[PDB]
Amino acid sequence: LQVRDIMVPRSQMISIKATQTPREFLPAVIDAAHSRYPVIGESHDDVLGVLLAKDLLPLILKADGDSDDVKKLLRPATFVPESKRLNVLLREFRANHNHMAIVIDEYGGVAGLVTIEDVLEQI
Amino acid sequence: ADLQVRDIMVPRSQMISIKATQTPREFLPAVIDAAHSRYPVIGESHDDVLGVLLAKDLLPLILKAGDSDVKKLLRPATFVPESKRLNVLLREFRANHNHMAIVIDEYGGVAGLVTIEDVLEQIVGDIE
Ligand SMILES: Nc1ncnc2c1ncn2[C@@H]1O[C@H](COP(=O)(O)O)[C@@H](O)[C@H]1O
Numbered sequence: 001l002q003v004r005d006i007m008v009p010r011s012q013m014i015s016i017k018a019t020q021t022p023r024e025f026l027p028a029v030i031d032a033a034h035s036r037y038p039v040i041g042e043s044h045d046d047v048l049g050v051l052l053a054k055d056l057l058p059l060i061l062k063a064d065g066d067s068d069d070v071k072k073l074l075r076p077a078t079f080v081p082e083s084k085r086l087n088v089l090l091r092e093f094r095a096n097h098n099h100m101a102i103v104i105d106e107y108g109g110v111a112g113l114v115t116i117e118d119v120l121e122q123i
Numbered sequence: 124a125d126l127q128v129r130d131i132m133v134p135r136s137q138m139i140s141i142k143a144t145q146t147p148r149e150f151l152p153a154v155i156d157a158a159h160s161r162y163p164v165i166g167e168s169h170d171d172v173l174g175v176l177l178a179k180d181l182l183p184l185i186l187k188a189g190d191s192d193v194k195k196l197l198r199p200a201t202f203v204p205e206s207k208r209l210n211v212l213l214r215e216f217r218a219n220h221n222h223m224a225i226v227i228d229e230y231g232g233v234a235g236l237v238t239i240e241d242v243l244e245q246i247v248g249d250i251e
């Protein structure tokens with residue numbers, strides 16, 4: 001199997017727009033209750049990095065944390081091609097201690113996202 | 124290799140936990156530093172696990188007035204014995220979609236904690 005077969009497709013990704021402050025994005029984030037979210041720029045094809053929910057914790061004890069710039073909290077996205085084999089990806093997740101990869105198509109567009117939990121249900 | 128939970132667990136003395144009497148103002152510094160997704164919450168001692176706190180459940184405090192009692196956020200813990208085999212543990216993580224279990228010794232005390240990531244660390248191959 002390949003990543004493209006088991007990915008969360010681009011339309012179904014819950015993403016955070018990089019222009020939004022926590023005041024604006026947190027309601028949808030809290031509703032979705034995911035651990036990690038792609039952060040986008042101009043479009044769903046413009047993935048800037050990934051936001052970990054737990055990385056928002058420092059904002060609780062700030063004066064004005066609800067107005068912070070999310071770009072500063074970003075981790076780089078791990079990118080994989082659509083054709084990446086699942087057995088290879090699983091070994092990569094172990095080596096790099098990550099949970100999420102952003103899937104890019106043959107044109108560099110964003111196909112979707114894929115997680116370690118999803119890989120385990122398929123191989 | 125008949126691998127068991129005790130072979131891969133984070134032992135009790137190395138667990139980062141939160142005391143159920145602590146406010147977020149009190150526990151957040153330790154929680155932020157440790158940077159885990161999930162924390163056992165303890166009552167009277169490290170053996171008295173009340174449940175688990177998910178870091179992501181603290182997000183509403185960014186917007187709310189609150190940082191001065193954790194118990195309302197508590198999720199039930201999943202408990203497993205030290206002797207459970209890893210193949211069985213993996214099936215349970217997959218069946219219940221949980222990531223963490225609290226490991227219990229033969230006396231009912233807390234031996235440590237164990238995660239799905241710890242299982243995969245043990246069983247998945249190196250990059251070839
Ligand atoms: N940001 C996201 N958008 C859409 N689906 C996601 C996202 N993060 C995780 N998932 C899916 O939800 C599952 C559980 O992840 P989580 O909710 O973070 O525990 C994953 O295995 C993916 O299928």
Ligand SMILES: Nc1ncnc2c1ncn2[C@@H]1O[C@H](COP(=O)(O)O)[C@@H](O)[C@H]1O
Nearest residue numbers: 133138139158159160161162238240241
């Ligand atoms: N509360 C905790 N205390 C100590 N170690 C932990 C805790 N949570 C997770 N771990 C360990 O850290 C690894 C990564 O989990 P996390 O930091 O939550 O992404 C796990 O696989 C465990 O080895």
